[model samples]
Target: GMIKLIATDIDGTLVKDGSLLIDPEYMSVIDRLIDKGIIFVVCSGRQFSSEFKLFAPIKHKLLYITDGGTVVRTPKEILKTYPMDEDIWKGMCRMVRDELPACDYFAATPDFCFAEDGGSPIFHLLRDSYGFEMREVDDITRLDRNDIIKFTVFHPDKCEELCTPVFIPAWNKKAHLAAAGKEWVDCNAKGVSKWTALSYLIDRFDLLPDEVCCFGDNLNDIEMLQNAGISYAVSNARQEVIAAAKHTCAPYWENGVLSVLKSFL
Candidate 1:
């Protein structure tokens, strides 16, 4: 059987040091795969616009699942969306303001990401490295019902001991919570994830689970990796991520994903 779908995370999987810098030969590989009817999907916690732009050469030929499945779209139309509820957003905001006042926080709507100021360490990474249209606000306190697509918080140090443990338990039931990285925790609408959103496409497209292949290398990617027929984690991935994946590849710096993707051809 042929691979009907291929979904891959952007950061720490296909990209290294925040740059894609694809090999010239890979574009031909991509064209051959698409020509053979493989539907490549860029699934990531990144904003859709950023993800799309990263793969702009192939943007028109694939679908995008971004913001940890808060939005799923094709080049032509958006197929699905899930945004945080107002009450949920309010509760989270209150906790950050009162309980963890010193922590850095960011909130995203479909249109833009909101943050405090340039002083926040993660601000530049979010704006420049991740290519988010960040709007500096006095306080990111206002979020209309169902307007917030995703929320994120970062710890300057000791995130594993401080941020993930504290926030994941508090917000897990109210919404989907994941320790995206060692220093970052993210929240989206309940039951929203790459696998959850891809399941819809699997059913609608009449494709079997075995026809899907995926690659990822982070905590936020665990569920999606588990759901794929052939799941691969890069060599340098975290232990939990490596455990969830069915196979392993070279590290991102070695263009691990592209190596495996070429084999698919």
Candidate 2:
């Protein structure tokens, strides 16, 4: 039997230098993996609009888990949605702006990611680097509510420091978190995670957990990695993440994904 589902983290795992890191050779591997009926899903803390845009070339062939699993969708429709309550989100955002001034923050509406203030270096980084629209916020939590999916809290350095006793203890029992890079942490509705989103799709597709493979490079991917059958962490990924994976693959730039897929698919 072969794996039937796939999930992956974006940024460091799939791209490098803020560009598509998958090489031509690995593209063939992706095709072969698809040819074998395996699904390659982009599971990230990124907004749905941004992730899907990056996935445009491969959209016809993939599913997506976005906003740290607060939103899940296919080409045709959204599979799940977990938006935060307006008032509570407002309070939380207020808390961040007032309490965690040293750190920067962004909000995900399943459509876009933006900073508390419109034109920060962070929003600039997102634009020039990833080409996403990030608006300045009078209140980030007040963004459109259609599917305002996730909250990405970032700092100039490690975001975990921001999430520690402050962010975590405040939201611990109230909401959930999917920490991304060293500088970003994604907060979502309680009880939601990439693992939860994947499980929803897997069961809907009548697929078993063991029939899936995954690619990731962050602590956010931990639950998904632990839940999947085969997991590969890119060489450039953080040491802690790699230590928890079943195998290791090439760095995004060196066409590492192909090496891992070639051995199997």
Candidate 3:
């Protein structure tokens, strides 16, 4: 069957090495696919505004599964959201404060990323490099808790070695925890994931599982990669991600996603 829907992770899959720019070829390919009446979804651990800006040229033509799949939306309307329990995330904040003092953290609402107004490099990176619509508050926990979808912890150098092991074990049973990249860990409500969010769209569009294609290159992308009928992991993907995907494409630097999408066109 011809593929009807395509979902792709942004960071390691589409653009590599922490670079914020996507190749113009990707937008051209996506445009052709949209012209062909295929659905294109950008799934990422980043917030909606960040992804929106990154895909500015084609933002209106795409659907978004943002905040590690805690929130799913189109350009104008939100389809679904899975907010973490107030107590669960509150406890996580306390845990990070007490146990991982070296890490900086942020809470993601549908509209903004709430971080404390501290001189943290992560805040600057998200705001300046990634183009997140960040709001610096005195205390993130003081905000309306029900609107928060995901909480992320960052450690510039030791996120993988330090933060993942600690956060995963402590909140594994209560929340959905995944290593977003080398420098960040994402926590969402239990059972919320990229695949879960995409499933909603699949059913809404009446597309069968075999008609879906996806791409990814990280731990958070594993579930969607595993579940899609046509799944590709970029050449620079982690070993576990490569194992989860059915095929491999050229690395992000070579515009691997563009090459694959061109074939469909």
Candidate 4:
């Protein structure tokens, strides 16, 4: 078995401007890999609806590690899915509505992502392009609920400066939380990390830890890359991800994925 499954990140790793950043030659490589019975999985922080909408056109032999790998499945099999713990999920919801009044929020509810009623234009396009609905919440501070698989606050002008103030304390006292997708740091009950769910799959398939490979770029992917047997960070990947990875590839805009695969694919 060469490589049974290849797990890649979505945003900066795969596509950049709505089209694939992977080289065109690798387009055939994708089909060829599938034909050879290898699997291509996308492990991302995006909600199910978002990832599914992007790949439904050409993805047939695919598995997904979504909600930061809290949920895993193929169109055929589902090994695990974790929703926020009831009490914490609800408490976070309340905190969003009351505690962090200005933070824009979004959540996956086994179906759609609901964000501020008039959230980002880019996010709205993402929702519509993928048929993933986004319910605009006029008053996010008042929303006290969970069963929410993921949540994020987008502060384009202030992301780097944002700290997990109330969130860190809340989770420390009751629940545990970790960052998911680069843009969204979230929390759940406990013992749920992208690496946690991924490790479960590695064991289930009897794949040696060293046989699992990953491609990612973000702080959230740090744990995931650390867990995989072999991991690569794209050139454009965050500084933190590159530091954590065992190897590095060219910038994604330069088809880092294909360049790295040329040695294999």
- Local distance difference test, per candidate? 0.79, 0.74, 0.84, 0.67
Estimated TM-score for each candidate: 0.83, 0.78, 0.83, 0.74
Instruction: Residues 13-62, candidate 1: write the lDDT tens digits.
Output: 87764564656555677777888899878888777777767787777888
Tell me the lDDT of candidate 3. 0.84
Tens digit of per-residue lDDT, candidate 4, span 1-265: 5667677877778777344233447556766776776667778866666666677654556778886777888766666777666666556667766766655556656566667655566476657665566677765445665456655554445422342666666665565555533444555547766787777777778776577678888787898678777789987777889987879987666778776665655
| The 10-residue segment with the lowest total lDDT in model 4 | 154-163
Better of 3 and 4 by TM-score: 3
Pairs that collide in candidate 1 are none
The residue ranges of model 1 lying beyond 4 angstroms of the native Cα positions read: 116-125, 128-131, 143-145, 158-169, 180-183, 238-243
Pairing residues by index, what is the TM-score of model 4? 0.74
lDDT of 2: 0.74
Off by over 4 Å in 4: 17-24, 96-106, 115-132, 136-147, 152-167, 176-185
- Candidate number with the higher TM-score (2 or 4): 2
Which one wins on lDDT?
3
lDDT of 1 at 106: 79
Which ranges of candidate 2 are over 4 A from the true structure? 96-106, 114-116, 119-125, 128-130, 136-146, 152-168, 177-186, 236-239
lDDT of 2 at 174: 82
Tens digits of lDDT, candidate 2, 50-133: 666666656677788876677778877887888877765666678788888787776667666657666678778787776776
Which 10-residue window in model 2 sums to the lowest lDDT? 17-26
RMSD of each: 3.0, 3.5, 3.1, 4.4
